[PDB]
Amino acid sequence: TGGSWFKILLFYVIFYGCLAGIFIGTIQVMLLTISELKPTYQDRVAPPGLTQIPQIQKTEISFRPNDPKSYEAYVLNIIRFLEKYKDSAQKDDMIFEDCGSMPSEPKERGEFNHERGERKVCRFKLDWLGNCSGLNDESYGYKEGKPCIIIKLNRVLGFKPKPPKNESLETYPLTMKYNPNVLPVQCTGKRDEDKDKVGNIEYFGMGGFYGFPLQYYPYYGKLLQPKYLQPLLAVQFTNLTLDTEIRIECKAYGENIGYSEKDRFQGRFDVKIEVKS
């Protein structure tokens, strides 16, 4: 009977409309507590993860230099990421500022407020990533057999890395360490045999320093600092044993930087490389 069907359907219509209204109202009342500039908590992200650009599936880099298709995907991924680091895209001056090529103290651009609008960002030049920038050598070192991986630190909003103090040097001591404004990053062999057969490793950072400069921090969060360019570190493994499953572990050292056994990509990462013959 339609006379009662209409009434019960009407009751259901108002009932579900009221339920949806309560749900939406509660969501909105929650969202007024959410800031658009600074996240409420950083429990899960505060220690930034350390990742690489080639974007390899199973933490494996497998390619034969003879066959271009073996490293075609890796080269395409690297160039696709590096498209935004070309000097053509950094030509603008209203948003991009040219800070010095020598590492310096982290620069504060103000508190996270809608006032002052969009902030300015330092420009990162590709020529600093020599031998792996692609400007001098297209397709990087995959043709010759000298793979390049670009190492980046995961973006954390309002994060200021603290490099290790001079008194306590957990990493390899260096005359050129320059700890006040460089976050050290070192790639070593995973185990004894890989350490023996890893070969020479050379690092390309700003001004020949090994790690991430500190003036590129803190990140302000895609709304005050869109088109942000995080510092990059290039690692080339030069000569390594052929037809060998070499495992490489790259680690970032610092006071804020932390490590966990559960998260294998927190403050460090693992790469497996075998160059087929």
Partner: peptide, 22 residues
């Protein structure tokens, strides 16, 4: 599992284990 730099609403990059903990 491949993506260890998932970009959230604030632009931060998230590790796979971190977002599985979330």
């Amino acid at each position: 599992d491949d993506i260890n730099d998932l970009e959230d609403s604030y632009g931060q990059e998230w590790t796979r284990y971190q977002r599985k903990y979330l």
